[PDB]
Symmetry: C2
Subunit: 158 residues, 2 copies
């Protein structure tokens, strides 16, 4: 995965929408309750230089809010979630004002599990951001892709 | 939808595999039991010039075989399934020996519902056929895409 050079994490703060998503395995995104079917509501960079995600996930028949802390690492644009550092967030690219591309990656199995998203600042379709997402995906072993309409962007859990 | 010119339906006979699929609506393909999650096993052109699909679909916790008859119409490469002719099969392109691209289309609602597949003759990934599928999708309002690995191509219901 080619990660963003010169990321300024403080500039990604505030509201985002999940416009599109893709994963290595159909099972990660197939169902509305699938393990990687999460929607980014907000990014909150911390004083420590960590990244807080506010997520919505469909769980047990409702839209559940979760705050996930991705801690800074010695590799820029790469953040660790778990104590083993096997669950990471990889920031691929952003222009801070319109779009952000990132992946969750799990390195616990011999086969990499990956789910990547195209985030936008406003609940609208941006073809530019979707083309940058598709280009970033070309080198990745993706088997499922989803994209949402503006109606879905403003709905709880899309 | 741009349909194939000069289709020779008799040459599509025999074994096929669903390598990739895409749909207008996430709900059509999201789940393993989703309404358009069907796998093409065989095409059987009839003496009348109709097209018989042998399909596998995951239904009520098992892999169910269905024979679906798509009848010829006065428009070449377009076949009708139902008495209202609202459910059609549209053949977009084939080289008969390697790949076939087609869509199911439902015209009963004001918004078109579409699901399109990339079929291959052998249970292997063909990047050429996937690029021809992606190019055929560019003009279509697709919001979900799935692709399968060779293991999945040889498995009942993938
Ligand atoms: C099997 N575990 C999947 C974890 C998926 N994950 C995702 C997925 C996409 C984008 C970000 C994240 C951040 C970590 C996280 C937190 C809570 C649920 C899922 C996820
Ligand atoms: C809501 N109805 C969906 C019908 C989907 N359909 C598909 C889907 C993809 C490719 C071919 C077809 C042929 C018709 C058919 C027959 C049986 C189940 C689904 C489908
Ligand atoms: Cl979102
Ligand atoms: Cl580190
Ligand atoms: Cl895909
Ligand atoms: Cl198949
Ligand atoms: Cl007709
Ligand atoms: Cl998509």
């Amino acid at each position: 995965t080619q990660t963003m050079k010169g990321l300024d994490i403080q500039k990604v703060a505030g509201t985002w929408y999940s416009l599109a998503m893709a994963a290595s395995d159909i099972s990660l995104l197939d169902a509305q309750s699938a393990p990687a079917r999460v929607y980014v509501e907000e990014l909150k960079p911390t004083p420590e230089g960590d990244l807080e995600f506010l997520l919505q996930k469909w769980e047990n028949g409702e839209c559940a809010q979760k705050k996930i802390i991705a801690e800074k690492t010695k590799i820029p644009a790469v953040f660790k979630i778990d104590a083993l550092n096997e669950n990471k967030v990889l920031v691929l690219d952003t222009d801070y004002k319109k779009y952000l591309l990132f992946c969750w990656e799990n390195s616990a199995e011999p086969e990499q599990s990956l789910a990547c998203q195209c985030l936008v600042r406003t609940p609208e379709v941006d073809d530019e951001a979707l083309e940058k997402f598709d280009k970033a995906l070309k080198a990745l072993p993706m088997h499922i892709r989803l994209s949402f309409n503006p109606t879905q962007l403003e709905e709880q859990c899309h």
